[PDB]
């Protein structure tokens, strides 16, 4: 189950989706290992 204070958030206003650390302020699309490469 992924790290505390992170969520998925939309791209372009209307496109796809980024993945954001909310408590730090860090924008990416990619997983910090608490959910892995496949699971």
């Amino acid at each position: 189950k992924l790290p505390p204070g992170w969520e998925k958030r939309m791209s372009r206003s209307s496109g796809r989706v980024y993945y954001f650390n909310h408590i730090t302020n860090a924008s990416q699309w990619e997983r910090p290992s608490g959910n892995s490469s496949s699971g």
Binding site: R12, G15, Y18, S27, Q28, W29
Partner: peptide, 10 residues
């Protein structure tokens, strides 16, 4: 870039 997916924001 301009149509923003934010991974490379410049």
């Amino acid at each position: 870039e301009q149509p923003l997916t934010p991974v490379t924001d410049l």
